[PDB]
Design a protein around this ligand. Structure first.
Ligand SMILES: NC(=O)c1ccc[n+]([C@@H]2O[C@H](COP(=O)([O-])OP(=O)(O)OC[C@H]3O[C@@H](n4cnc5c(N)ncnc54)[C@H](OP(=O)(O)O)[C@@H]3O)[C@@H](O)[C@H]2O)c1
Ligand SMILES: NC(=O)c1ccc[n+]([C@@H]2O[C@H](COP(=O)([O-])OP(=O)(O)OC[C@H]3O[C@@H](n4cnc5c(N)ncnc54)[C@H](OP(=O)(O)O)[C@@H]3O)[C@@H](O)[C@H]2O)c1
Lengths: 477, 477
């Protein structure tokens, strides 16, 4: 099977003859080939997107919302096909995959509610017989770049707001897991999305993606991915000063205070690390446990970790599937060996799975490291896998300083029944997305917003949607 | 000789370095300033970070009252600060009095947003859960200013930054810092706590570059040339500070066939030759419909020939000097290049001659005619009293001409045709549009540039809110 690219309502090949394979993490089966365009394909799809946007913007916002609501429902109609495709290309549990498809639909349906919230401002002038008008208008062409952990939902997360607001979009999905995203091309056509309003091109992030983000025709970049790629895009955007909405890496601490409910805290900590095989940007990446509850907490928590069943993600008994590819599995092995080198203990796991049920695929054991000090690399380098270091602490001010000792500042989780600890978080905890007495997991109406190198400018909600519009100011005498 | 205002104290550059400040009127050395390099960035950032922690705890009404007092002290010393602006920058005295006033009203206007910082209570999809989105200060703001209105640009940024609970590190232009440095004295007089307002002087490419990329810089608000802003965007990859950058312009001034010619001629005259062309919204290319060209030009050239160039303290002067020798040479180079490309020097085009102008940097009001759209003077920002004039035949043509540009800040159009004015909203790629009047924006507006004219905009509601960060809480009960 070989996919094409969706450009201007047609299916076309990369102008270089290049393809790229897509490999299942479950069994290393080559699932399909995709086009592997390079920088020379950017201008065509941007020009097509530019032309289509002029007509799309003229459509009443209510019609745009009606088309996208149909698009989102067509996605829901094909939930089972798309979920099984996500399981095969990306490796997530089937039940998580079904949840990702639903989130794709709801990300689009949530944005449709903003179809009627684009009013401008009538501003009173200091000068007589004069009016100041501040209109909201589309930016034009949005470039949307996605990551592989939730590729389909990350696309809907950006398609929805961009098209509702009257923009056209050029989606460059991750090259690791683009197949389900490419299938949206056919549903876009079924829903009646006009030709060129939704484009899907596949190719190298550092070639095609880099050409798209700095291009003259690109008015906005919405991108999800690692911090180094986001930094490259920031540099590129100096060439066009396109608005950049970049949602990048995390190193979320999970803090268990002395007065936490240990059973609630342990279950929240368990899911927050091992959801999606650790491949969540809000994951519990470093667990801080107060020394007074350490022993009792860890006995509860470790009983949970040791019962995680790693297996085939179509098997309903599986609690954790494979890692997405060999590069990411190698990263697990290197983080573990390096942590042993700097003095840490491997309490559980810490190796790739052995045995007949796992000779194909990229399988890593749920891993807990102890005797970890704050300065070890595993406390600072994002893991994005099932590796959890555990650090003791003795006071709030101590763990706060640990929490902020980071280049990342996306998620943070804390379990405590002390309301004054929680109130100090507003001014003292340098994370943009804070969970109190529960695990990670954001909502469409929230604001997914990362401090420091976790991004520059948030996503979702009203403050995410508002970034897909531009302003135009009129001084009218 | 001036020092730098850091942490409530006055100190020298840690290198031994100083830099002269020269009057454009007579080339008199006015003062020496500190010429600090990158090695002074950390220290001023450290005391700003410390001072912000206590500043943000003050009730917002108290911060507004301190800033209101700061704004009135600036007004109290209007005559001293205006004459200082005249000597260091060369603007006309009455414009200098206006700039001082706009410095105070920039701050006073920002004090009105002191009670417009409410967060959001957001209904959760889950029972017994609350989503809270708080608005908080960003932290340390770095403020970089340009030389054409140095004191107002400072106040345009000091006002919103400090009202919102940030601290500020102001790096003024090295060409014209003196009046800006005087603010340090007034900040002590007003009771601004030590370290909330800091003023450091040094090269933008050394000290400024180190300030904008530093880990302690949460936001950059900068005004200046497009190449400098492109350097700041690249540097911001290192910290992902929010960057509010207000860069170059190339504003078209458009005279449609149905324009009130006398009204259009006067608005065009001031829009180009205000502040010797040193305004980012200046009329930089004049498009005149061929059907009114001769009548409009006879009216317009009459007004140009009446411009009196001379001493900016003399109330008879309508235009003062260019700011320095390099900017003056740029005037001579742009004219010579335009002639070599085929333009006519209809008027002016030379350094002023004769005794009375043997000292200082004096250039004549200059009009270039028989210009084609592709000449360099139609594309490269001049920022001086040079005006090319281009014929056109249709609205569609002049929209293409207007948009054929790397800049997209200001635009001016004179017409009676409501259909033309309505088409501007979708077809004219400028963020700040003036209809049947000249340039000049207002504090309640939104000063916003498309393309390489800047990132997000400044002033008003949407400028103020960029000085705030968000924090999202998912609180489970
Ligand atoms: N903060 C959030 O909301 C959020 C949510 C999910 C994931 N993330 C983060 O994203 C990362 C996920 O893994 P990942 O490997 O997919 O991230 P990645 O390697 O940085 O890839 C992200 C995307 O950007 C492209 N890329 C790489 N360089 C680029 C460039 N110079 N210009 C344009 N695009 C470029 C990629 O293309 P190629 O695949 O072709 O290289 C890919 O489509 C993790 O760090 C995770 O924390 C963030
Ligand atoms: N859009 C607006 O609202 C607005 C309003 C007024 C002026 N402008 C523009 O400003 C330009 C003229 O002013 P200007 O000559 O002063 O601009 P400039 O030469 O770019 O200088 C701007 C400021 O930034 C600093 N600079 C230069 N490189 C820097 C860097 N790599 N990092 C940090 N700072 C750096 C400068 O420091 P040093 O000069 O001391 O070395 C200076 O303080 C014109 O193009 C005009 O259009 C824009």
């Amino acid at each position: 099977k070989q996919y094409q690219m969706y450009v201007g309502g047609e299916w076309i090949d990369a102008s270089n003859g290049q393809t790229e394979p897509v490999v299942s993490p479950i069994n290393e089966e080559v699932l399909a080939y995709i086009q592997d365009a390079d920088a020379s394909d950017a201008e065509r799809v941007l020009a097509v997107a530019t032309t289509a946007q002029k007509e799309w913007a003229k459509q009443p916002a209510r019609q745009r919302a009606e088309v996208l609501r149909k698009f989102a429902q067509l996605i829901r109609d094909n939930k089972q096909y798309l979920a099984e495709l996500l399981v095969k290309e990306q490796g997530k549990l089937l039940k998580v995959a079904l949840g990702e498809v639903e989130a794709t639909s709801t990300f689009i349906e949530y944005a449709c509610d903003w179809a009627r919230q684009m009013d401008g401002d009538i501003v009173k002038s200091d000068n007589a017989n004069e009016q100041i008008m501040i209109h909201k208008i589309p930016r034009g062409v949005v470039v949307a770049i996605t990551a592989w952990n939730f590729p389909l939902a990350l696309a809907g997360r950006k398609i929805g707001p961009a098209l509702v607001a009257g923009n056209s979009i050029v989606v460059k999905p991750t090259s690791e897991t683009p197949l389900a995203t490419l299938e949206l091309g056919y549903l876009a056509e079924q829903a009646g999305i006009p030709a060129g309003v939704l484009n899907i091109v596949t190719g190298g992030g550092r070639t095609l993606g880099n050409e798209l983000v700095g291009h003259r025709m690109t008015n906005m970049v919405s991108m999800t991915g690692s911090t180094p790629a986001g930094q490259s895009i920031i540099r590129a955007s100096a060439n066009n000063m396109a608005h950049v909405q970049l949602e990048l890496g995390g190193k979320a601490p999970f803090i268990v205070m002395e007065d936490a409910d240990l059973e609630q805290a342990a279950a929240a900590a368990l899911h927050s690390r091992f959801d999606n095989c650790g491949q969540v940007c809000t994951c519990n990446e470093r667990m801080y446990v107060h020394g007074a509850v350490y022993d009792e907490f860890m006995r509860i928590f470790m009983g949970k970790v040791e019962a995680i069943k790693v297996g085939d993600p179509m098997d309903p008994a599986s609690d954790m599937g494979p890692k997405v590819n060999a590069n990411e599995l190698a990263h697990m092995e290197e983080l573990v060996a390096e942590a042993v080198d700097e003095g840490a203990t491997v309490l559980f796991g810490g190796k790739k799975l052995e045995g007949p049920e796992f000779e194909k695929g990229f399988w890593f054991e749920p891993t807990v490291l102890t005797n970890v000090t704050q300065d070890m690399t595993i406390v600072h380098e994002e893991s994005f896998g099932p590796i959890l270091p555990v650090i003791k602490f003795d006071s709030f001010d101590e763990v706060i300083e640990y929490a902020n000792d980071s280049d990342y500042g996306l998620a943070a989780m804390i379990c405590t029944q002390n309301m004054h600890y929680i109130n100090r978080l507003l001014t003292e905890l340098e994370s943009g997305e804070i969970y109190v007495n529960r695990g990670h997991g954001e909502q469409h109406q929230g604001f997914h917003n990362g401090y420091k190198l976790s991004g520059t400018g948030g996503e979702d909600g009203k403050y995410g949607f508002e970034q897909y519009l531009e302003k135009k100011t009129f001084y009218i005498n």
